[PDB]
Design a protein around this ligand. Structure first.
Ligand SMILES: CCOc1cncc(-c2ccc(C(=O)NC3(c4csc(NS(=O)(=O)C5CC5)n4)CC3)nc2)n1
Ligand SMILES: CCOc1cncc(-c2ccc(C(=O)NC3(c4csc(NS(=O)(=O)C5CC5)n4)CC3)nc2)n1
Ligand SMILES: CCOc1cncc(-c2ccc(C(=O)NC3(c4csc(NS(=O)(=O)C5CC5)n4)CC3)nc2)n1
Ligand SMILES: O=c1ccn([C@@H]2O[C@H](COP(=O)(O)OP(=O)(O)OP(=O)(O)O)[C@@H](O)[C@H]2O)c(=O)[nH]1
Ligand SMILES: O=c1ccn([C@@H]2O[C@H](COP(=O)(O)OP(=O)(O)OP(=O)(O)O)[C@@H](O)[C@H]2O)c(=O)[nH]1
Ligand SMILES: O=c1ccn([C@@H]2O[C@H](COP(=O)(O)OP(=O)(O)OP(=O)(O)O)[C@@H](O)[C@H]2O)c(=O)[nH]1
Ligand SMILES: NC(=O)CC[C@H](N)C(=O)O
Ligand SMILES: NC(=O)CC[C@H](N)C(=O)O
Ligand SMILES: NC(=O)CC[C@H](N)C(=O)O
Ligand SMILES: [Mg+2]
Ligand SMILES: [Mg+2]
Ligand SMILES: [Mg+2]
Lengths: 533, 533, 533
């Protein structure tokens, strides 16, 4: 193959996944088919168990892989569709080796981290690099592998040991390594402190990996002296020391790496055979008009959602002002303890141009989301409900229009006489890519989806709308292939009141915002009336 | 509790398991109930898959735990009966944490080696320390934990990190640490080189453990200067620097540790409330007569077997000269390529005073073991067959006495018309402690077992004697509680020709040799005729 | 240049200096001019302060460099003459950098170990590699650099960091690295334990050096499996894994490395443009006759002396049986406490074929050396006194022949009325290469020195023979160019009673034993009478 490893140096959060994604879009702009792998040094088999305050926004792949948000960054910088196993973990690789041991496949020998786990990592990286994850069935010409976390933590050591072997298993023309470090600039000092980068690259070389590129996460751009000091103490050429500094938009991060010569480097270094990103950045920096959108949440947990709104905003040509609202502040209980939280949350929601009610589980914020959907009905503010927001729209309709004031989910109040959304597992979770059929032409949503008869979108839910109560209910315009499951709902006599049972955000790209997020943004600025025209 | 960790320094093989066992017998001689745990930094769930050339002699516990030979050293130095989970491994602890993660028991948080695996290790060590593994149901007053391998290998790091926490979770009076190092004395140098011990203890302190005792595996005793240099560079008191040197018998190893003051140290250091070992050593060193016993093997793989013979030898008051014979050298095929191997193997077998035919699996040495049992029949040399040796005695009888010249196992020749031993799994492997009933009084074996109606012994086999052919066959004196399975066989008109289907060696102690190994040793020196009298 | 670094792995003493010397003689046999450097990670500026029980036998170079014995191994395997600075130390390099800092030569910047000390090491290694230390003024084509001690000790870290830079300063064709490890084979285990080699090479790679060759100091030869395991865990080709095992003579160590293919490796690896050692080994292994030589010492401290005797032995074609005698056991004081030591020491001295009385300082053994020279006079056993042994021969003559029974040195009894050897510093120590003139033809020593008018030999003393008492004294056949200092003495009417004030051993080679050591060996077997004939 051709491999680029991307290792983290000093801390997480420093945009290493944006660097990996930017390097992938740079390679793709060179005419290469490109795949990507995230290694997460946790013991978890997939992210499908995280409370979103830790490793927030589990991104759901077509196969039902509940993976880290960086896999979603890969799908948005590169036109790819990944599999579960593009998220590698210690849980997955140790369980693989343990099951393979119990099978007797290791032939009655000792099994131990070196070699056998570090072999298994290389086997995995070889497998997932061959898979044509790109928008055509042609084999990837390069694979960008990101090692999550910081090097020299106990969990990251097996993977660096595997890559230390890998660079001699495949030849050096087939394996490059980027180190993404931090160069802090303290309030206490004003200097750009290279010391952590030196010690991190010293540690990485102790684990037997050189940086071929040293990418410094700077705030403000590096001085020449600091770049030279990094080049010296990392024992690498200045041309291979990159600063990624603070820039006006995400769209400039590939352009900065381009300017920094990484394209030219990888072309020679791997012996290989962004004008839109200029436009997207320059377009963003000249958006004079604005749209204000309420996001009524519970939980970074809405990373894909925020990005989908920003794609939609860039496409309508407005700035976006996301009014982040805790849905538990909108609940009347908060007015008893902290009326300041209540009245700030309701000033936010009421001044919005439209509302977004994203997915989740558990009782927190449920009556607040039902009230934010109520506000969307009676004030006629444009509404999108995503996954849970759809279910709560059936609840809010039922309570006010049908007078079923008790009505709820079987999750939140199982004692209710009108369970209008019920537990309905797959005959497991409705998890991954399902096909929804549009049951009609009387849908703005169908027209936003290009007037297509069907769409295929990633779901992540156990509950569905009750088919008994459906007869009384609120036009369920999108339904599954079985007709068992309601997957898009649209309310009559409203500018834009849509529930989608799936997660549109997972298939939003800058070049193609998801049509429910686009329709919401278009509706909130009135421009939907010109779009459908 | 009270805990003593025992860590390995420079290499394996240096008798760390003998030190742990000796420290346990020293503690037991202080009137303490004592348990023990082996940690093996391999990914294997139990040893029940090893080809015995790697981590040789899988010792089978009462519960069917196929564990490392050091668990068997614990059962022979201390009057204890262990469980599977007294052998801890990375495979067991990672699989525990992974299953616990998949259960959601880690409450949707990240799971990672520190803390969660290092917690799980401490939980395990707390559980297995409370279990009364001793010959009475009273709780262990101290637990000797052995860490297998050398410290600062990638697999041993989680366990040392766990013990680094543990010493502050329980108080320092509850946790002591011994480091077992090597002090090499090269042919190239003649000096006792302390440098590896210094660097090993430097490394161990980098992992946050001090040696409370430094045990030097010496060849020849340490000089004063070398002990002082070790005390200096390990930064510990000379009284806490121990030499375990080469000694005439295993029985002197507790006595050397006693002389070295470890008893007195542990009494004060853990705030706690060997005369037989003098006798056993002094007895061994005055055995003027000898017995020569053939061990016809395939595979250290016979560690328990060799020890059981040596207990039996010490009890009859003879030295033992074990004629180690590869059973594939006795096969006529070896006479075509290497007649030197054949004739040396047959000089060994024929000059023996008795023969032992120990357990195993696969076709290697099977016709050689059948011929060594044939030699035992026709020359009337005393024979014990253990596990497989019993099955091959039914085969050898069938071939010569019944004229069923084809006869074999369903393992070795499944096409045979007389499958006299057949695959007969438990309605799994017959693995662990089963009760055998003696079906008669016409057994020397019953009388060696104290004239008891039953015995309980550890088995490890899938195959059993065919109950159809049994009617023609060779007195099956020991049978299971169901009468389905033949578990001891005894041939008439022979001094001592016994097959046992179990492994007697696993329940041999110096103070009580297993009666089939004792009866064999007694028979080979003729003394059985005085014993049964 | 071309550089070969030789690093130590597990312990010292394992013959790393013999490997460096053997590699140098192999390179020299390829027609290359070769120099060598020893780095000793001690804080001492030269070895000229060590009590010879620590880093024994300070070897004195032509310039007066009191250096480690490995510099003397270089001069005996390779026809070279080294300078002080071929022994590099932390004391020398830190003092260099400190003086250079105090000079302001570092231009008011910070000075710190990396870069500035690690620069200074490379500067030193560049300087000393250019010096034609060979027997002709032609520049060295390769430099073998030995790093003393074990890698990953705090003192060795600057040097490995320097070589980690050096391999990228000069190109990889100019820099190769050998790792000399130990593979122990314990009495406790019988296996050849590769684990320390794995961990040592793991540590070395953490410091950023690969072994290009892994040299295993074996006792018995490596098995194939152990070599393969080393090749695997050191991540290097089997052809580059060398065993140096126990062999019958020093002369076979280059031949074993030759057989192991290191010549062929270095030729390709460094892109470069032993039949006598067959002969010397095969000659040694067929010496049927023997010579027994008394070495009367105080203090490995006599390494050069023992080697010089063995060159002389090989040249006369006898084995050598060196009777190592502590000169303090010969003193009558020892007969009062330990008559066993006295009578064993005097059985040794009296049964010898000749005696050697080597250099030293301080009062220990002085009356014993005077008595061993007395025994040489009155029994007519052949005597060589080296440095101090000469001075004590003037004392022993004075006491018995002149009746000056008080007589001694000003070192040992400054109150004496006949100070026959006196403190006589250079108008400092008489240290390094001085020219001695033979004052006559009435000398066997002159004839052994080829009948030359002068010789040039390395001295290391402050005391000299008193020119007042000289008039009464014992033919001082060798004197300095000034006539001030007596440098060789020869007693009349004796087979061979010679004192030399210098150290002949420092210029002994296998191909050319030093003539006083050769004359002594010839005398002790009577063969001198045929040699001078
Ligand atoms: C090493 C990184 O260094 C630096 C340095 N300076 C700045 C940033 C930076 C990081 C994140 C963001 C960000 O999140 N911006 C938003 C957005 C819109 S679209 C999208 N991402 S996306 O959908 O994958 C699409 C690209 C393919 N993000 C509005 C929400 N904006 C700037 N990153
Ligand atoms: C740190 C250890 O240092 C040293 C230093 N010097 C020597 C030994 C040494 C090691 C093993 C052996 C050995 O195996 N000997 C035999 C035997 C009989 S009984 C038994 N062990 S046993 O059944 O557990 C019983 C005790 C409870 N072993 C004959 C086979 N003999 C000596 N160990
Ligand atoms: C990695 C080394 O591995 C092994 C493996 N096996 C054996 C040896 C070994 C080491 C030292 C000795 C030794 O010292 N022998 C003597 C001698 C005579 S000449 C001389 N050395 S010398 O003068 O420099 C001359 C050569 C240029 N030494 C008699 C005193 N003999 C064998 N070394
Ligand atoms: O308080 C003091 C005094 C002196 N020094 C000396 O300064 C040297 C540099 O220590 P720094 O922490 O300044 O590191 P650096 O220059 O490599 O990296 P940044 O500043 O960009 O973070 C050290 O190696 C030590 O000799 C200190 O570190 N701190
Ligand atoms: O007590 C035990 C049990 C098990 N093990 C397991 O054995 C593995 C090998 O540990 P060794 O110390 O046997 O190392 P090695 O085979 O690489 O080298 P030598 O024997 O030649 O010195 C370890 O990684 C661990 O899983 C032990 O080390 N020790
Ligand atoms: O070749 C040489 C020359 C000098 N030295 C110097 O010797 C010092 C001691 O290095 P050693 O390896 O002799 O260690 P030690 O004395 O602590 O332990 P053992 O001998 O008992 O194994 C080192 O710290 C270094 O300064 C060497 O190690 N090797
Ligand atoms: N993805 C979500 O928003 C989940 C919604 C709801 N808890 C369900 O399981 O259907
Ligand atoms: N424990 C053994 O000796 C095994 C014997 C035989 N292979 C069986 O499985 O019964
Ligand atoms: N080199 C030696 O043997 C020293 C001899 C004596 N102590 C002197 O200084 O002259
Ligand atoms: Mg600084
Ligand atoms: Mg030492
Ligand atoms: Mg091993």
């Amino acid at each position: 193959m051709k491999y680029i490893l991307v290792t983290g140096g000093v801390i997480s959060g420093i945009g290493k996944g944006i660097i990996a994604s930017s390097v992938g879009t740079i390679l793709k702009s060179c005419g290469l088919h490109v795949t990507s792998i995230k290694i997460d040094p946790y013991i978890n088999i997939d992210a499908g168990t995280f409370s979103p305050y830790e490793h927030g926004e589990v991104f759901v792949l077509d196969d039902g892989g509940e993976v880290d948000l960086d896999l979603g960054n890969y799908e948005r910088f590169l036109d790819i569709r990944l599999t579960k196993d593009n998220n590698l973990t210690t849980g997955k690789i140790y369980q693989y080796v343990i099951n393979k041991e119990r099978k007797g496949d290791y032939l009655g020998k000792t099994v131990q981290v070196v070699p056998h786990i570090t072999d298994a990592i290389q086997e995995w990286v070889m497998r997932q690099a061959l898979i044509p994850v790109d928008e055509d069935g042609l084999e990837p010409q390069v694979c960008v592998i990101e090692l999550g976390g910081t090097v020299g933590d106990i969990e990251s050591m097996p993977f660096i040991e595997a890559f230390r072997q890998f660079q001699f298993k495949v030849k050096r023309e087939n394996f490059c390594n980027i180190h993404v470090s931090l160069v802090p600039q303290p309030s206490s000092t004003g200097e750009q402190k290279t010391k952590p980068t030196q010690n991190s690259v010293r540690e990485l070389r102790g684990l037997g990996l050189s940086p071929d590129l040293v990418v410094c996460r700077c705030s403000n751009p590096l001085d020449t002296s600091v770049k030279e000091k990094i080049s010296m103490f990392c024992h690498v050429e200045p041309e291979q020391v990159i600063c990624v500094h603070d820039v006006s938009s995400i769209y400039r991060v590939p352009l900065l790496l381009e300017e920094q010569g990484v394209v030219d480097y990888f072309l020679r270094r791997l012996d290989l055979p962004l004008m839109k990103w200029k436009e997207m950045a320059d377009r963003y920096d000249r958006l004079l008009e604005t749209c204000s959108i309420a996001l009524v949440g519970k939980y970074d947990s809405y990373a894909s959602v925020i990005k989908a709104l920003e794609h939609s905003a860039l496409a309508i040509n407005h700035k976006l002002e996301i009014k982040y609202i805790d849905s538990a502040d909108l609940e009347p209980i908060t007015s008893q303890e902290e009326p300041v939280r209540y009245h700030e949350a309701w000033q936010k929601l009421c001044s919005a141009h439209g509302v977004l009610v994203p997915g989740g589980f558990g009782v927190r914020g449920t009556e607040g989301k039902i009230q934010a959907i109520a506000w969307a009905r009676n004030q006629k503010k444009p509404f999108l409900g995503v996954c849970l927001g759809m279910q709560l729209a059936v609840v809010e309709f039922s309570r006010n229009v049908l007078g079923w004031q008790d009505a709820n989910s079987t999750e939140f109040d199982p004692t209710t006489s009108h369970p209008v959304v019920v537990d309905m597992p797959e005959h497991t979770m409705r998890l991954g890519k399902r096909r929804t059929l549009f049951q009609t032409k009387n849908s703005v949503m169908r027209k936003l989806y290009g007037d297509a008869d069907y769409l295929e979108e990633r779901h992540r839910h156990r509950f569905e709308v009750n088919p008994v109560w459906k007869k009384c209910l609120l036009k369920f315009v999108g339904q599954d292939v079985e007709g068992e499951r309601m997957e898009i709902v649209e309310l009559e006599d409203h500018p834009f009141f849509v529930g989608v049972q799936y997660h549109p955000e997972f298939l939003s790209r800058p070049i193609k915002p998801s049509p429910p997020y686009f329709g919401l943004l278009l509706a909130s600025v009135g421009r939907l009336s010109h779009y459908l025209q």
